[PDB]
Write a protein that binds this ligand. Structure first.
Ligand SMILES: CCCCCCCC/C=C/CCCCCCCC(=O)O[C@H](COC(=O)CCCCCCCCCCCCCCC)COP(=O)(O)OC[C@@H](O)CO
Ligand SMILES: CCCCCCCC/C=C/CCCCCCCC(=O)O[C@H](COC(=O)CCCCCCCCCCCCCCC)COP(=O)(O)OC[C@@H](O)CO
Ligand SMILES: CCCCCCCC/C=C/CCCCCCCC(=O)O[C@H](COC(=O)CCCCCCCCCCCCCCC)COP(=O)(O)OC[C@@H](O)CO
Ligand SMILES: CCCCCCCC/C=C/CCCCCCCC(=O)O[C@H](COC(=O)CCCCCCCCCCCCCCC)COP(=O)(O)OC[C@@H](O)CO
Ligand SMILES: CCCCCCCC/C=C/CCCCCCCC(=O)O[C@H](COC(=O)CCCCCCCCCCCCCCC)COP(=O)(O)OC[C@@H](O)CO
Lengths: 307, 307, 307, 307, 307
């Protein structure tokens, strides 16, 4: 078994696609192992770059193909190189840009907390012919400032496990364990834009919709309620334009339905408070004491729905 | 005839395009057959990876080209490899990402039920020179949780048939049957987002539009009806933004037209109930008993249109 | 002159881009000619697939390059193969996905009628060195059902003509005619979605906008007319979102301008019918007999604009 | 110096991107020069197609690389070929699709007038080793009809100049002039869609906004003015959706600001005409003679802004 | 150590992506060094173009691979060439189009001020085997006119530093410093479109929203305030459509929240000024002196928020 020593430099993480559950990672990858000694020009290490490699693999050089398990498609490999030392140690340094995929959960959308996973594994050699020895992850480049959409919380967490594939039991018994290296990078979303432009004006609209029970007549209450319902529909549209598509509801999509519920409960209370008549002429004030309590009632419903 | 034994690992299914009727599949494919015995280095199986293959096919190795019948374009083949055993059995394992196409029917859109089909066939060898022996489909990776947009219902259904092409009757008589392997994966859409954000507020808007016959005068009824018609137009827009394009109407696009019909029937009833005058001064109440029945009338029309 | 016999299998036609006037075609293409006799392994025909070909053209095999005249870019050629028979007849079967271009006329948009053209021609050999003999087009796969956006009406129409290029008169006199094969596939758009969701509610909005002359006062008429004008602007937006961009107006964009004209003629008639006063106190009813005639007037204008 | 004779066939021009200032051109390019005599099979000219060429350049054939100066990226070169005549004259015919770039000025947007430029130059050989002799441009295919978005006005204008690069003064004195061929194709935009759907309804909205001074009271004037301001905002949105992004204002974006100015001047005049009171009870009519003059005033401002 | 002399010609800078913080650069790059003397055909310099190079590197020519440190993916390298002089000096001239990345700060969005950075470094050779000698940047092509979205302010600023990598301390002690060349190009956004179409009508809407305290009754004030709140929501949508996505708020997104605050403070003042009653019949005028001061109050708040 050859002991391969990986090191992954993560330059940047971006492009989080919420519907495909993918995200783009750009960085380097440096594998290193020890083979047979060789004679190079002089004593200095020989460096082979890009297209030169395929001239060395045809001459019998052993270079494994380390694939990313959770990549989507194929990484756009830029430069790559092989450094060979007279001692017999080879270093394969390549540069990748990949559209990786994970199982993400956006169910608390502006106050999100995701983790980004990179999985790596030999494509053909099991852990009796190629095993990983360690892994270092360097994420110095990725910053924590207000400008970035994701705050990276702490260093990466690496892991070296042994996956088992039962489907190779028919063609290769007793040797089907593959050595896999995992990398997890935690991240928290930047909730500033979604707190100032989506939560606060929706709160103001819901809080100002309650002040239609101060109007005196009944037709004014109804016409004002219909104007407010058109306002809430236009606001649901404005949030539906500048937002990421999802197959499940976010926090803001609970708040929009809370706005619809407040508007419809106001319309129901208006019709009920008008409709308390003996034959059609008797006015009413009793249920219209809900100018200070039905706000507190639906605010209690919302604060319970938070908890 | 060579007996080829296929196995397809479906990693993920996503990206359903409703207008082109395509969907992206990502996974592996492992074909396996038995050829001539050979002498490899030692007794262990020889592994050829990526670019090495085209150096073996030039030396006369027989590797068939299995194409996907319903793919669109060409799959983005990532890694691939050939494992050759001294016995004489060869294993071709490749990784694909393809934009497959099927005949989908989105006519009940949020409560949809689709099936995803992968068809596979030799590109050149008919079933007298290459026939498939079996196929196993492994879909362990694809989960059924709330987060995924599609729930996969049960395992895949495989099939090995013999397609006949009559157009090769002129150049190759008596041998035109091609062995094809089919794979069907059933799936149901996740209707939660389309039930909470599109059906419920539209139901509330249609139900609150009926309470314009509680207003006393006639001009207030008309102005309120025009405000409600603008509300329904803004709602049709809001659903037209966050939705998949189709050449036929969905369920939600029947509900929008039901909202238009309710608004226009309310306007017609308002004009008719006002217009019952002898010369222009006689008021009316008789047809305005439809504050409790015309709701039930259009609800009966809608519940019949469901059935 | 070599007699080449083409056959084109059209698998699917989709992706009609209205602004670039392109459309994507996916299918096969099978050319066939007769060369020199040869000795193959045994008597059976030898099959060369994919990358093998470029090893045969270097050894002097004559394979012409048939290009698509109206393609945009280069087709994404998938698999391809050459079948050589001891007799001396060669068959070149390839698979293409191309973004073809034509001169389309969307001036009657929902009730459209287009035709899809595929043009094919040798890239270098004129009709004294390579002429086409026939062409069969097989479009069995393309269905006529409600689900498809385009109904294909009848089989394809093929044509073999001889194009003349005068610009080769300076370098190649007397031989500049190139043999071209044309293919036309007629298609009609599916107008169901554009009849139920765009024509009917716009008709209802225009028909309900006429009932503002039933209101009694003058300020109510004006305020209601301005609400209706905002409704028509929101509807023009809703159609502008879910529609294909064009540099000329469709039928629906005549109907939107008809709605604007109806709203503005209603506002003009309202101002004129109020403004018939001797000094400012005299009411009017005479021009307000247009609650039953100005509908018929603008409906006559619309029905004339249809014819 | 070798005399190269270029000829460019422009098949189609489309895809004008207003923000990147690019546009896509699709067509052919035929260069032609005279080298050494050679012996071909027979006397007939030998034709080399596609991949064959790189087998001839390795054998010492001299084929220059003519690059497009203003292209963005690299053209998607389709087929290409070399025709060699026993005399010694070579013809290189290739097919390109490129995303070219120019300096465009959309400051009069619907009534635009652009020109499309193709610049061509040898990549390495200066005008002492390779000079262009002439150029013919054939644009027969591009039509002038209503369907096309751009009307091509007259034939192309070609030019052969000698660019000087001073930065090669350090490595190559006395020889730094490069022979460049320029091609200009004038084009005018089709203003029909932007005249019927954007100028006319905006004119109608501005002209109907002036008739709020016919209302009697003061609160009705203000509420109607606010409804009209919402109408103008919705119209600015409708034009902002179906339009090309720009970093400077168009003609239509002057008309939208003119609509905003008309609405705000109406609100200012309403507040001023109401606010002429001695203590709060005195009515006014004097400044309300602007129902016929303030239309003419802002129309004079607009007609001056045209000139 | 080989002294490499770089020169970068920036043709165009465009395509600024605000969410990925990338931008596209298109231009040339000319490296130049001095190797061993050689014998070329004649005395004139030999020119190798495109695919010829990989035939020279296999024959042992030393051409380094200079990579862009901050590129995303791999540049779309077009043409490239090597000019070799009998003296022994080699010139490598290539053409790139790259999607570069930087740390951009859009926190003052229409009045922005960015800088575009290009970083360049040898991929494998440290500064004991390859060091850069100088760099000239030529940006003559990029203009400062109104048409361009970015005004380039002054020439580029270049820099040659020595980066240290500690992770190579295990495999290469005492030699880990890499010579890097940096290029900065300052740019200012064109704020004309965002000053005429977004700041001025929003200012007019906020300034006209203050004139609801001129209305006499109380229900008219509330209904007008709700119409104005719907106007501000529609305006926030119109700015959210034609704008670049960001994870932090811009200046215009402070102005939208200022509009929401003005509307809600008007509603609060209306409810408070009505609600000053002894039991429900007492009118009020005292707090309604804020028709001239609450404008100045919120304008003072805004002008303080500017400073
Ligand atoms: C002083 C006297 C004291 C009297 C005491 C007064 C107390 C009276 C109680 C009122 C109950 C509150 C109802 C008001 C509804 C408030 C709305 C609300 O907060 O609930 C949200 C919206 O619900 C909604 O729109 C639901 C629509 C509401 C429409 C009608 C409102 C209530 C009227 C029904 C009357 C009974 C009918 C009789 C049937 C029993 C739920 O979030 P959502 O679904 O997005 O998340 C799903 C997500 O979890 C999916 O994963
Ligand atoms: C106590 C006294 C008892 C009296 C008894 C009272 C009974 C009176 C009956 C009313 C009939 C109901 C009409 C109301 C319309 C309700 C609307 C409705 O439910 O139908 C939907 C919308 O239709 C629509 O908008 C149609 C537009 C409706 C506009 C007018 C409504 C009715 C007024 C016409 C009056 C007669 C005219 C005289 C001509 C005969 C159809 O879905 P849609 O098309 O999307 O699917 C197509 C998809 O299948 C394509 O594949
Ligand atoms: C009982 C007494 C009997 C009296 C008799 C009553 C008869 C009175 C006649 C009215 C004429 C009808 C005018 C009403 C306009 C109706 C609107 C209409 O149908 O025409 C469409 C829209 O036009 C429009 O918006 C045009 C805008 C209309 C705005 C004003 C309407 C008429 C008012 C002008 C008054 C005269 C002015 C004085 C000047 C002569 C044209 O489609 P569009 O362009 O999209 O296609 C272009 C496409 O072909 C480009 O390729
Ligand atoms: C019978 C008695 C006779 C009395 C005589 C009556 C005469 C009274 C004169 C009125 C002046 C006209 C003002 C009306 C404004 C009309 C609006 C207008 O036409 O101008 C456009 C919009 O301007 C605008 O929105 C500007 C906003 C207008 C808001 C207020 C309107 C006028 C009120 C100010 C009062 C004075 C204030 C006191 C300060 C001196 C300019 O296009 P825009 O910028 O897109 O192009 C920029 C592009 O060139 C960038 O490259
Ligand atoms: C003659 C008598 C003299 C009396 C003296 C009169 C003086 C009375 C003082 C009023 C204070 C001004 C409040 C008016 C709010 C004006 C609104 C405003 O200018 O602030 C902006 C919006 O704030 C907002 O919408 C905030 C929402 C405002 C809603 C209510 C307004 C004030 C009502 C609260 C009353 C007290 C409540 C009691 C609790 C203490 C802040 O930008 P934004 O966040 O986008 O940037 C965040 C970015 O920096 C993130 O990086």
């Amino acid at each position: 078994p050859v002991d391969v020593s990986v090191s992954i430099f993560i330059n940047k993480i971006y492009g989080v696609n919420t519907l495909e559950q993918t995200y783009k990672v750009d960085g380097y990858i440096v594998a290193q192992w020890t083979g047979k000694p060789r004679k190079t020009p002089g004593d200095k290490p020989l460096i082979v770059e890009n297209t030169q490699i395929e001239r060395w693999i045809n001459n019998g050089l052993w270079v494994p193909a380390l694939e990313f398990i959770n990549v989507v498609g194929s990484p756009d490999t830029g430069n790559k190189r092989l450094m060979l030392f007279p001692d017999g140690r080879v270093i394969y340094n390549a540069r990748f840009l990949g559209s990786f995929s994970n199982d993400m959960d956006f169910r608390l959308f502006p106050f999100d907390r995701q983790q980004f996973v990179l999985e790596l594994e030999p494509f053909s050699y099991n852990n009796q012919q190629l095993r990983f020895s360690d892994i270092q992850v360097y994420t110095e480049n990725i910053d924590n400032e207000e400008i970035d959409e994701w705050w990276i919380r702490g260093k990466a967490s690496t892991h070296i496990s042994d996956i088992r594939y039962d489907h190779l039991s028919s063609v290769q018994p007793n040797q089907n364990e593959f050595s896999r290296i995992t990398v997890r990078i935690d991240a928290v979303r930047n909730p500033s834009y979604y707190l100032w432009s989506f939560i606060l004006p929706l709160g103001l609209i819901i809080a100002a919709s309650w002040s239609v029970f101060w109007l005196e007549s009944f037709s004014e209450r109804l016409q004002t309620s219909f104007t407010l319902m058109l306002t809430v529909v236009a606001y649901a549209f404005y949030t539906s334009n500048i937002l990421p598509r999802l197959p499940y509801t976010t926090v803001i999509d609970q708040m929009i339905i809370a706005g619809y519920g407040s508007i419809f409960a106001a319309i129901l209370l208006i019709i009920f408070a008008h409709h308390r008549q003996a034959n059609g002429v008797e006015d009413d004030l009793l249920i219209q004491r809900c100018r200070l309590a039905f706000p507190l009632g639906f605010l209690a419903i919302g604060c319970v729905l938070v908890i």
